[PDB]
Structures are given as structure tokens and as C-alpha cells.
């Protein structure tokens, strides 16, 4: 699209990260551990996925 593909970033969609990043296993987006509505305070050492890699108003889980 305009600004690249939009859905492709090595940083946080919301909190504009740059260093430490936790990304999905599906899409090319990176987050903290609480940038989305289904936020965690713990670091998911196993698996982790986005709510919908977008506005977390929908049901991700």
C-alpha cells in the first residue's frame, strides 16, 4: 500500500518499539507483551500471538 505494506514492521504497531520485540508466528508484526487488549505482565516463554494484529476490539481468543 502507501507506507509500505503497513502490516509489516520490526517494531511495535502502537508503542513504536525498536530493540526488544516479541512477534507472532503468523504475521510480520512485533510487540511488547501488553500492547494489545489481551495484555500480559509475564513474558510468554513458549508461544504467543496477536489479538488480530490490529485494533483489539475484536475477539482474538
**Within 17-56, which residues bind Zn ion (CB under 5 A)?**
24, 27, 29, 31-32, 35, 50, 53
Spatial contact of 36 and 12, defined as CB atoms under 8 Å apart: no
Q: Which is nearer to Zn ion, 7 or 45 (CB)?
A: 7
Determine the Cα–Cα distance for residues 30 and 7; give it in Å rounded to an integer.
10
Contact window for Zn ion (CB under 5 A) among 1-9, 16-24, 38-46: 16-24
Give the binding site for Zn ion (CB under 5 A): 12, 15, 24, 27, 29, 31-32, 35, 50, 53
Amino acid at each position: 500500500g502507501p507506507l509500505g505494506s503497513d502490516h509489516h514492521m520490526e517494531f511495535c504497531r502502537v508503542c513504536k518499539d525498536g530493540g526488544e520485540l516479541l512477534c507472532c508466528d503468523t504475521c510480520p508484526s512485533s510487540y511488547h507483551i501488553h500492547c494489545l487488549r489481551p495484555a500480559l505482565y509475564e513474558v510468554p516463554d513458549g508461544e504467543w500471538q496477536c489479538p488480530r494484529c490490529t485494533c483489539p476490539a475484536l475477539k482474538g481468543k
